[PDB]
Design a binder for this molecule. Structure first.
Ligand SMILES: O=C(O)c1cccc(C(=O)O)n1
Ligand SMILES: O=C(O)c1cccc(C(=O)O)n1
Ligand SMILES: O=C(O)c1cccc(C(=O)O)n1
Ligand SMILES: [Eu+2]
Length: 207
């Protein structure tokens, strides 16, 4: 499957793509404002994620740090990134269909649209100014809006036992972005797409 990753933000982002225990494609790349990077994701990839990283420094070996979404200091991510990270999440070719969503469960850093480029399903978007509106107690200095689990490490925010409800913090993410997961047991906003669909992830879709 191809994912066209487009940075419409006015600032550079460092895109990242991983399934947690491995890179997808090269795993990461710099996208200046307006740039597009098309990656190949193997069919059957389960639990893949794409995200943006902001304010990164990398040396000539591809090692450094990002203020948001750092993946163990690598340009080419092999693992998931440090919250806060808005997540484009996908599982492909799962019994004939693909499944996509956006999630704020690991916080929010950059607004994103995640849509199919092929027929048969809708896209999802979280484009609101979550960083600007972020509750004070969730604000990340280096940028972004942390999820409550990251900040407070309670069973209720982290849904540790598989039993948890919505919270004042989850409801903030949900209010700003109804079509993204706001906590672990949120009413799902996963979209079913035809198996082997192709996609576009756009950062800053409205600006
Ligand atoms: O490599 C990492 O990110 C790491 C390693 C050990 C513990 C933790 C953790 O508890 O977050 N994270
Ligand atoms: O298991 C973990 O602790 C973990 C996994 C992916 C990324 C990170 C991180 O960036 O801290 N930590
Ligand atoms: O030091 C770390 O590895 C760390 C710190 C904050 C969050 C996380 C995480 O979400 O894994 N990991
Ligand atoms: Eu960690």
């Amino acid at each position: 499957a191809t994912f066209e990753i487009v940075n419409r933000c006015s600032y550079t982002v460092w895109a990242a793509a991983s399934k947690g225990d491995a890179a997808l494609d090269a795993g990461g790349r710099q996208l200046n404002s307006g740039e597009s990077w098309t990656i190949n994701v193997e069919p059957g990839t389960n639990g893949g994620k794409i995200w943006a990283r902001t304010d990164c420094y990398f040396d000539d070996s591809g090692s450094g740090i990002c203020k948001t979404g750092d993946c163990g200091g690598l340009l080419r991510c092999k693992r998931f990134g440090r919250p806060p990270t808005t997540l484009a999440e996908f599982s492909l070719n799962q019994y004939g269909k693909d499944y996509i969503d956006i999630s704020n469960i690991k916080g929010f850093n950059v607004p994103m649209d995640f849509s199919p480029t092929t027929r048969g399903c809708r896209g999802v978007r979280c484009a609101a100014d979550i960083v600007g509106q972020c509750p004070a107690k969730l604000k990340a200095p280096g940028g972004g809006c942390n999820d409550a689990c990251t900040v407070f490490q309670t069973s209720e925010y982290c849904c540790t036992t598989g039993k948890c409800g919505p919270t004042e913090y989850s409801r903030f993410f949900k209010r700003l972005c109804p079509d993204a997961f706001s906590y672990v047991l949120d009413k799902p906003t996963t979209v079913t797409c035809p198996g082997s669909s192709n996609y576009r992830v756009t950062f800053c879709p409205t600006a």
